[PDB]
Amino acid sequence: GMASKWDQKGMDIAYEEAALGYKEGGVPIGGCLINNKDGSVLGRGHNMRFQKGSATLHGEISTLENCGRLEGKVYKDTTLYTTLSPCDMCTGAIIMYGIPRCVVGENVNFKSKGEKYLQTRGHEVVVVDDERCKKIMKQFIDERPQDWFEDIGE
Amino acid sequence: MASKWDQKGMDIAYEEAALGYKEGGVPIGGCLINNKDGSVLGRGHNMRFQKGSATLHGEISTLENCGRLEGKVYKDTTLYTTLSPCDMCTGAIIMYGIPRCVVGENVNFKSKGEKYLQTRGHEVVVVDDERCKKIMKQFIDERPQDWFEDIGE
Numbered sequence: 001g002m003a004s005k006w007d008q009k010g011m012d013i014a015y016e017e018a019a020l021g022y023k024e025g026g027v028p029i030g031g032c033l034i035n036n037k038d039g040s041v042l043g044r045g046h047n048m049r050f051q052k053g054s055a056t057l058h059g060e061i062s063t064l065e066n067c068g069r070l071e072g073k074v075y076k077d078t079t080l081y082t083t084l085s086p087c088d089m090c091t092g093a094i095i096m097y098g099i100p101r102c103v104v105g106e107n108v109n110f111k112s113k114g115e116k117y118l119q120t121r122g123h124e125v126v127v128v129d130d131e132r133c134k135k136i137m138k139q140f141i142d143e144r145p146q147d148w149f150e151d152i153g154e
Numbered sequence: 155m156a157s158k159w160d161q162k163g164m165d166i167a168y169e170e171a172a173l174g175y176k177e178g179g180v181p182i183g184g185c186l187i188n189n190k191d192g193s194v195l196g197r198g199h200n201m202r203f204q205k206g207s208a209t210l211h212g213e214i215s216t217l218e219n220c221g222r223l224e225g226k227v228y229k230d231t232t233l234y235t236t237l238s239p240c241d242m243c244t245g246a247i248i249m250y251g252i253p254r255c256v257v258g259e260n261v262n263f264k265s266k267g268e269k270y271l272q273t274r275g276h277e278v279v280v281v282d283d284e285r286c287k288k289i290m291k292q293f294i295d296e297r298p299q300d301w302f303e304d305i306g307e
């Protein structure tokens with residue numbers, strides 16, 4: 001519901017992180033975590049597979065790592081913004097921490113069963129169809145498909 | 155045939171949990187074995203306290219310690235974990251297509267993940283290992299607030 005007032009701020013930060021990751025030579029997937037009560041940014045991140053040799057730092061995981069350790073209650077009134085619809089692992093992180101809302105840049109270049117699983121587990125998912133996100137991810141997939149396939153375990 | 159490596163995998167996972175306990179962290183350990191030849195691709199434990207990490211659960215730390223791998227490697231692996239996986243760690247198993255998860259115990263913790271893995275075609279074996287139950291219960295007795303932080307409670 002009413003946390004959607006933060007969604008342009010959150011998606012703009014997530015897209016800035018994706019574009020920074022793209023410039024660094026990584027997968028252009030970015031995220032951020034916003035406190036719904038006052039719009040504060042708890043953290044922001046992007047995929048660090050190529051930057052750090054990481055098998056786990058998807059953009060959403062890197063976002064949560066960059067927030068640092070938090071008391072469980074903090075997550076219960078946040079929104080996680082991601083430029084791309086989440087894989088099952090990133091979905092599971094949202095569910096484990098009880099983050100109530102996930103706002104997704106696009107789900108055209110990639111969608112797992114996680115998007116719907118978030119909804120059936122009681123989380124809100126909003127897909128904003130941001131063409132900046134679609135274009136940068138399609139450019140990556142077109143130019144480096146085998147690096148994309150590595151990021152999703154294919 | 156992959157069950158032939160389960161004593162090796164759970165012994166490594168327990169060793170990793172005991173090392174994490176000694177380091178002052180959450181005593182949850184793991185390892186990933188190549189079912190084809192028994193080789194240890196990686197081993198790890200929870201690094202929440204050691205690294206100030208909100209994401210390095212034992213199973214995530216194990217996958218990070220394997221390094222980057224071709225997707226095809228994961229398809230004939232077993233992930234060993236001393237404790238039944240949360241929804242995030244369940245989701246990592248699904249995303250990488252790891253076919254088997256061998257779990258030390260599900261008495262101190264179980265998520266909807268255990269069943270969800272099976273719904274989605276992954277084998278789950280719960281060995282009910284007393285060493286794993288004892289170390290996790292000791293930690294929860296001493297530091298329940300730190301355990302709760304690890305599962306977003």
Ligand SMILES: C[As](C)(=O)[O-]
Binds near residue numbers: 082088090110151
């Ligand atoms: C959208 As993804 C590959 O960071 O789970």
Ligand SMILES: C[As](C)(=O)[O-]
Binds near residue numbers: 241243305
């Ligand atoms: C069993 As767990 C807290 O590492 O998902």
Ligand code: NA
Binds near residue numbers: 110111112
């Ligand atoms: Na899909």
Ligand SMILES: [Zn+2]
Binds near residue numbers: 091
């Ligand atoms: Zn992911």
Ligand SMILES: [Zn+2]
Binds near residue numbers: 240241242
């Ligand atoms: Zn976990």
